Each structure stands twice: as C-alpha cells, then as structure tokens.
UniProtKB/Swiss-Prot annotation, chains A, B:
Span covered, complete protein: 72 to 364 of 403
Keyword Transcription attached: no
Principal place of residence: other
One GO CC term, this protein: bacterial-type flagellum
Protein name from the UniProt record: Flagellar hook protein FlgE
Location relative to the cell: Bacterial flagellum basal body
C-alpha cells in the first residue's frame, strides 16, 4: 500500500472506469490486478507515460492511468565494451606459435570482459595480446562461455603504439560472440581507448566496461519526490514507468465535492492546470514511497 | 566455416552433447575446439568413424560425432622397396679390390633409395653393383645416414642373369637399416624385379620405389560428395576420418520441428532410415567442401 502526500498546493488527478476526471489530495493507493494505482473507491491515479528504450517520460502526452507492470526488464545485448591495458614494451615476441588459447606461452597477456546477448546469457570474452614486433600487438578474442566455439586463428585487430607509447591505430574492432542456447550472438564494438605501452612494467588490465546486462525481475518500485515512478530490478538496473501529474485550480472553493475528499472541476473552480511535483506551481511530494513488489 | 547444405531429400543427422538425435538439411558447419563439426546451436554432425591402418570406413558402424583431429599422421616404416636397373653385359670386372663405398673404381654402379623408420627418420640406402664374372653382379647395401653402421664387406645379394639378360635369381633380399637418434631400424624387402642385363649400354637405374613415409601435419580437410571426410597431410599422404550419414523418413510431415530448420523423429514420421550420399536412397552432396587447417 503506497502512501504519498502533497506537501504544498495541488491535487492528484484520478479517473473512474468511464474516464471522468477527478481530483484528490488523498495519497492512499494500492496496486490492483491491472497494475494501476487505485484509491479506496477504485479511481486510478494518472500521470505521464514512459515510452522508448531506455524508457523516458513524455511530458507532452495526455495524462493516463499510471501502470507499474510486473513484466521482467528485458536483457540488453552488448553493443559496446572496452578494455584499457598497459602493455610492457620490453616483452618478448612469443617463440611458441601459433597462437592458441590453451597454450599460455603463445601469448603475452589474457584479459576478460563479460558481455551479454539479447536473451541475457553471459559470454566471458577472453582477449589475448600477442606481441608481433616492436610497438605492435595482435589481439585475439574468444568466447570462453561457448562450449562449441572455434579456436581463433586470425587476430581481430592489431594495436600499434607510437614512440611515446600512445595508441595510434587498431584500437576499435567489431566482435561477435558465440551462439549459446540458440540465442542470437552479441555483436559489439570493442575499444582499447587509453591503452598504452609503458617503457617498463608488467602487462596489466586497468579497466573494463560494457553496456549490456542480464534480465531483471521487479524487486521494488518507488515514487520519487517529483512524482516519477521507477522500477528497481534484480539485474541492478532501473526503468522509469511514468510520472504522476498534479493539478491546481484558480478557485479551490468552487470544486464540487464527490465525497471521500474527491473533487470535480466546475465552471466556478476553473479548469485544472497541470504540472509536476517540484516544478512551477507545485512543491515536491513530502517524501515519495518505496515498496517491495 | 564449411557449407554443404542440401536442396535434396535426406537430412544430416546431428546430436546434442547429451546424445539426443536431431536432423537438418542445413549444412553450415564450423570445426570447434572439441574437433567436431557443429551447427550454429552447437549440435554435432554425425557419421561412421574410420578404423584400422590404413583407416577405412566399415559397413557395420554406429554413427558417432565426426571428428577432425589435429593430431599428426604417423610415419610408416618402410617394408618394401624396389630398384629396376639396366646393367651392361660388356662392363669390366673392377680390378680395384676390395669393394669399398669410398673407392669409385671398386664398383660398377651406385644407386640410392630413401626409406623411413617408424619414427619417420630418412635413411639414404646406397646400393652398389659389382660385376663378379659373366652375368653375375654382387650387390652391397649401406645406410649412409647412420655413422655407426659397419662398412659393407659382404654382399646382400647376387644378381644372376640368364643368356637373354633376364633376371633369373637373387632379385629379392631383406635389408635392415641402421638406427638414427635412438629410433628402431626399418626392415624391408628390396626387389630388383624387371632389372635386366643389356647386351650393350651404360649401367642405369630406371626406377625406384618404397612404401614408407615421414609423419605429416594436417594441412587441409575436406568433405567429398559422398560425405567421406578426409585429412590431407604435409607428408603428401591422406587419411579417411569418417563419413557423414544421411537420414530419410517415411513421413517427413510427421517430424517435430525443434526450431531453426532442426527436427526430431516421432511416431508419426517413423524411425530414421540411414545411408550415405551417392548410394541407395540418397544422391550425392551438391559439392562437398575443402578447408585449410
């Protein structure tokens, strides 16, 4: 049961099953089976919808019943990843050829970045650096999570460093994962931005990142103090679901009582003028609410 | 990446890693780290294994995952060799005695045949012909590749020719090589079949042969149009590795779609009836494939 209060002026904007619009400062709502937020009389709380991916609020749409779906948040397939490596200029060119993922002396360094496909399976992508000549390093990649993968035989790219050790070419390359449990592979741009070749040191990965994630179950939802409604999911991600609209009238004394501190607009009240908590005419909600699903 | 897809009837027969059997006309295979030919879901193409030495495909075989091992093809120790020589009846009996591999006027002719031991070392076998009297020629042999081998002071055989110059006796003799780098010697039958004594000419070796060879690294592999899978090795030899099986059903409409273009047998389809491309129920593969290692 959500309890949300208006600190200063304004009313929540509600609708009944016929679409007639009403107003109330009562902030007692329960999530019903249709995933709407409803007061004790069944009227639905309204606000701006969220659309797109990532979802965003459309403040120019007509207000409609807020929904808090329990639909899982879809996996996002990785399309970018990065690895920042410091490579040692004094490293040997490996004598053991060819390169093999199972031959630890056929490469100079292995790193790993875990990426995700459209279905949300993890692919632990191993990245191998093989010094070929002064200042140049072949890069192989391999999906270690794919039990039916091919052995890489050809470098994905070659990093070339200038005399000061700054990466001058070969720093971005398109990688495709293996196909796990039928799912279509992730295809992503792998960047080695900020990698350098040190005059001396040991091969070391300083940072990695990637922009995908697994699917998430709804763990909790919340109303922020500006009325934005946000879902929190089990994949450590969030999605905006909508934003509560508030209403003010030129004359509150003209509003028609429906009982149960619900009100209707009249000629005497003027038209409802709409906005959001914490902007323009309206103070923030006193707090908002956070509720486990 | 191999491509042998099927516009005809017959299905390839695949297994998942649990041994469950599936069928598909899709012929897109990759050679994975496990050395199986897999489709995009990681299912393994199956067929008859190769057995024996030389490896062959039997009619009694259970289909199993095709393998294309990267393992070396083993050397074959030589067990036969031949040298066909035309010897000159007017040749002198050498006056310089004794016979010595180092004294070029102590023999009438020298030839060479390179044989192999089971490790694959080459032994350069020198063969010396010394006319002893009318129509008889002593033959000495020596492994020039073994520094510890005793100098030949006794003939390995004596060739005797009849009045027409046809070989009458002494034409077949077992030879044992020396040893190289701690490996066991080769033992082979040396044949002088088709050697002749000409009324007049110069001593001349027309042909040699032997049946051994060095070890070979895998260079390429191929699928022939009858589905036989063959490895090609750097010793200029080949090995059969297996033979892809095809399946047909009494009722294809009865097969259970597994997604993609993969199918499972059912009571409605009947049991799979197996064979090979280019025989019985099945026409040849449209082409086959050839891939470098």
């Amino acid at each position: 049961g959500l309890d949300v209060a208006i600190s200063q002026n304004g009313f929540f904007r509600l609708v009944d099953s016929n679409g007639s619009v009403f107003y109330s400062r009562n902030g007692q709502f329960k999530l019903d089976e249709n995933r709407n937020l409803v007061n004790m009389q069944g009227m639905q709380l309204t606000g701006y919808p969220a659309t797109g991916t990532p979802p965003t609020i459309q403040q120019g749409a007509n207000p409609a019943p807020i929904t808090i779906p329990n639909t899982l948040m879809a996996a996002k397939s990785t399309t970018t990843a990065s690895m920042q490596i410091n490579l040692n200029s004094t490293d040997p060119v490996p004598s053991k050829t060819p390169f093999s993922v199972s031959d630890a002396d056929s490469y100079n360094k292995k790193g790993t970045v875990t990426v995700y496909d459209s279905q949300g399976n993890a692919h632990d992508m191993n990245v191998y650096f093989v010094k070929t000549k002064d200042n140049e390093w072949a890069v192989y990649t391999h999906d270690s999570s794919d039990p039916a993968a091919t052995a890489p035989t050809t470098a994905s790219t070659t990093l070339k460093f200038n005399e000061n050790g700054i990466l001058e070419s070969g720093g971005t390359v398109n990688i495709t994962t293996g196909t796990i449990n039928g799912a279509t592979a992730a295809t992503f741009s792998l960047s080695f931005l900020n990698s350098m070749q040190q005059n001396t040191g040991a091969n070391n990965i300083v940072a990695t990142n990637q922009n995908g994630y697994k699917p998430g179950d709804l763990v909790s939802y919340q109303i922020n103090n500006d009325g934005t409604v946000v879902g929190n999911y089990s994949n450590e991600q969030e999605q905006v679901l909508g934003q509560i609209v508030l209403a003010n009238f030129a004359n509150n004394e003209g509003l028609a009582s429906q009982g149960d501190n619900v009100w209707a607009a009249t000629q005497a009240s003027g038209v409802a003028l709409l906005g959001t908590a914490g902007s323009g005419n309206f103070g923030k909600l006193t707090n908002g609410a956070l509720e486990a699903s």
